Amino acid sequence: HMRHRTLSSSPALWASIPCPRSELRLDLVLASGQSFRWKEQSPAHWSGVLADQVWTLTQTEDQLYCTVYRGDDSQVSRPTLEELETLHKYFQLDVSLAQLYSHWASVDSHFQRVAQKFQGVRLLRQDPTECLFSFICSSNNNIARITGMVERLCQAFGPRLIQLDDVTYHGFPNLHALAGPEAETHLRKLGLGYRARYVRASAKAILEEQGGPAWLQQLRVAPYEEAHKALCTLPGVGAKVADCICLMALDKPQAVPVDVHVWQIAHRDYGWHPKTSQAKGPSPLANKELGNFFRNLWGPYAGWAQAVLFSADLRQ
Numbered sequence: 647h648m649r650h651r652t653l654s655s656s657p658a659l660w661a662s663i664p665c666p667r668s669e670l671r672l673d674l675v676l677a678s679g680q681s682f683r684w685k686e687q688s689p690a691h692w693s694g695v696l697a698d699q700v701w702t703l704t705q706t707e708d709q710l711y712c713t714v715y716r717g718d719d720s721q722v723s724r725p726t727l728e729e730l731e732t733l734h735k736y737f738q739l740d741v742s743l744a745q746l747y748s749h750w751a752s753v754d755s756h757f758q759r760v761a762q763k764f765q766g767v768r769l770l771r772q773d774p775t776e777c778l779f780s781f782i783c784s785s786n787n788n789i790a791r792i793t794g795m796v797e798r799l800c801q802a803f804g805p806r807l808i809q810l811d812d813v814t815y816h817g818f819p820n821l822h823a824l825a826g827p828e829a830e831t832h833l834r835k836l837g838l839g840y841r842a843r844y845v846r847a848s849a850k851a852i853l854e855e856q857g858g859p860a861w862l863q864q865l866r867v868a869p870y871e872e873a874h875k876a877l878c879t880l881p882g883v884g885a886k887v888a889d890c891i892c893l894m895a896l897d898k899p900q901a902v903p904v905d906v907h908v909w910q911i912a913h914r915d916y917g918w919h920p921k922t923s924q925a926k927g928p929s930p931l932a933n934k935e936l937g938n939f940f941r942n943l944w945g946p947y948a949g950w951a952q953a954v955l956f957s958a959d960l961r962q
């Protein structure tokens with residue numbers, strides 16, 4: 647019965663946050679391979695789940711409009727102050743992206759050109775667990791197919807929140823749920839393939855070897871290099887996936903994920919080749935070197951600059 651809200655339909659239930667498009671463009675962020683939990687259900691209206699609640703997000707030129715669906719058959723109302731703070735933290739709007747863009751552009755002419763069109767590409771502050779297992783599913787995959795895997799994984803293992811039109815929303819499952827004896831077999835049935843093993847195995851590892859999700863919070867306050875190494879002990883988690891989690895979940899802005907995409911960008915757009923390393927093609931050593939290159943160039947928010955180029959590279 648209940649359906650997706652729009653700003654025209656039910657404007658009484660919405661609430662705004664002052665946000666220029668220099669700071670945030672929804673359409674360049676919510677589907678740029680950071681989160682896989684957002685979909686443009688109706689034009690310019692992005693629906694998705696955040697911390698066991700569903701949101702719908704739209705924006706004008708200088709406002710970010712948002713509405714919440716609590717789901718527990720309570721009185722529908724506007725977002726509260728605390729829910730708005732949660733969304734503020736999610737987009738990290740405390741950090742000025744306008745000043746970052748100008749800073750990166752001063753030492754990078756290529757970024758300057760791309761920054762013209764692609765403004766408001768910022769990093770989401772994601773839940774560690776959600777980020778971890780999502781990016782375990784990302785190996786040899788694509789954003790469309792990953793989005794399917796994660797959706798199905800949440801329906802099978804996660805708690806139901808609400809239904810809107812013909813879309814049922816589920817919260818992300820806890821580690822215990824993914825660590826069960828039947829979890830791998832079920833995940834293979836859902837089409838994850840070899841990734842099903844890593845999902846189950848990393849669930850068990852975090853519980854048994856690292857002591858639950860408190861560990862991921864410890865890595866959030868630990869240094870980048872400490873957190874990175876710790877993640878790489880998990881099944882299915884290497885340097886690429888570890889860096890993604892660092893950048894997107896563990897508040898390491900200097901983390902620069904190096905996969906085939908950024909290796910292409912580095913070579914084509916910056917003319918970079920591995921100098922310190924001997925081998926011409928990709929390698930663990932050469933990928934690490936390229937990460938160091940971008941940190942040296944861009945500085946302590948190098949991962950944020952990387953996301954601007956990554957997002958721009960998706961759009962042909």
Ligand SMILES: Ic1ccc(Nc2ncnc3[nH]ncc23)cc1
Pocket residue numbers: 678679680784785786787788789792890903905952953956957
């Ligand atoms: I397949 C697949 C899916 C998603 C990604 N996401 C990213 N990887 C590296 N840097 C990034 N910055 N923003 C997203 C992002 C990569 C490969």
Ligand code: NI
Pocket residue numbers: 913919
């Ligand atoms: Ni070359």
